[PDB]
Amino acid sequence: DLKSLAKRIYEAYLKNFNMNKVKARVILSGPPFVIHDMETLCMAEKTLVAKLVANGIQNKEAEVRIFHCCQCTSVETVTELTEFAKAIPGFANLDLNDQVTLLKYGVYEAIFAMLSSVMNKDGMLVAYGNGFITREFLKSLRKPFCDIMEPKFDFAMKFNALELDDSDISLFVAAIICCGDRPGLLNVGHIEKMQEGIVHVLRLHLQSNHPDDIFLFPKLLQKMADLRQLVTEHAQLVQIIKKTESDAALHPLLQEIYRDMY
Ligand SMILES: CC[C@@H](Oc1cccc(CN(CCCOc2ccc(OC)cc2)c2nc3ccccc3o2)c1)C(=O)O
């Protein structure tokens, strides 16, 4: 039954996420338009996000346009994660408020975990796999926008070195969502039992799928803690940008996620 549960989780991930590691690797293997400088950013925008640059002199600064594009992907991924969570045994049986709380704290940890699948050491896929933005270009942006993506590349290079596949990532994302220590949960006991169940599925799956790496489960527990810290730091940077960059608006769904988070 635990093998069946692992497969159900994987099937739910394949249905619900537009991007996965298989799809990303096909693309990254060599088509995506390469964004490596301001000229190619602007060319890519004209083809792939035309509306955002159809304002002439009224267009926002390039860094702010990138900030906006990043948030759009997060909004869509939050929708995918909310539908995915229904496949987790017990999740749909929880009080609606607890569902909201688990998603509030888990979505960005899951986002940064899955973001790793579209990253290599030189850059990352964007716009549903139709662009590839270089790591060096993102580092070249004016402060503080150059500080957004680099810590996520750093996380991703080490996470990708574990050589997880989608079957593993689906269970890891389910485990992220099930954390029983999120602030403000009502039914901690039922959430802890839901978490115990999914973590048991994850541990057995990693044992079967990665017999060569006897420590992969505790490695991933540590990655979960690393992701929590990465999200805490990211939220702090987002708040700095919101307060100091008059054009860098935050989408209302994301402002609700960030509100009172850390
Ligand atoms: C800034 C505040 C914002 O921070 C971030 C920080 C890091 C990553 C994201 C979301 N993200 C990057 C999208 C870039 O999207 C474009 C699109 C077009 C473009 O130029 C034409 C440039 C960038 C992403 N990709 C994914 C791929 C797979 C799985 C999950 C994914 O998550 C948001 C937040 O907090 O929401």
Curated annotation (Swiss-Prot):
Record's subcellular location: Nucleus
Regions annotated as coiled coil: none
Maturation and modification: Ubiquitinated by E3 ubiquitin-protein ligase HUWE1; leading to proteasomal degradation. Phosphorylated.
Principal subcellular localisation of the protein: nucleus
GO molecular function per UniProt: DNA binding; DNA-binding transcription activator activity; DNA-binding transcription activator activity, RNA polymerase II-specific; DNA-binding transcription factor activity; DNA-binding transcription factor activity, RNA polymerase II-specific; DNA-binding transcription repressor activity, RNA polymerase II-specific; lipid binding; MDM2/MDM4 family protein binding
Positions of region (Required for heterodimerization with RXRA): 98-227
Annotated positions for site Essential for heterodimerization with RXRA: 227
GN (gene name): PPARA
GO cellular component: chromatin; nucleoplasm; nucleus
Boundaries of every NR LBD domain copy: 33-260
Residues of the full protein shown: 202 to 468 of 468
Oligomer and partners: Heterodimer; with RXRA. This heterodimerization is required for DNA binding and transactivation activity. Interacts with NCOA3 coactivator. Interacts with CITED2; the interaction stimulates its transcriptional activity. Also interacts with PPARBP in vitro. Interacts with AKAP13, LPIN1, PRDM16 and coactivator NCOA6. Interacts with ASXL1 and ASXL2. Interacts with PER2. Interacts with SIRT1; the interaction seems to be modulated by NAD(+) levels. Interacts with CRY1 and CRY2.
Domain of life: Eukaryota
Similarity annotation: Belongs to the nuclear hormone receptor family. NR1 subfamily.
GO biological process: one example: cellular response to fructose stimulus
Protein name per UniProt: Peroxisome proliferator-activated receptor alpha
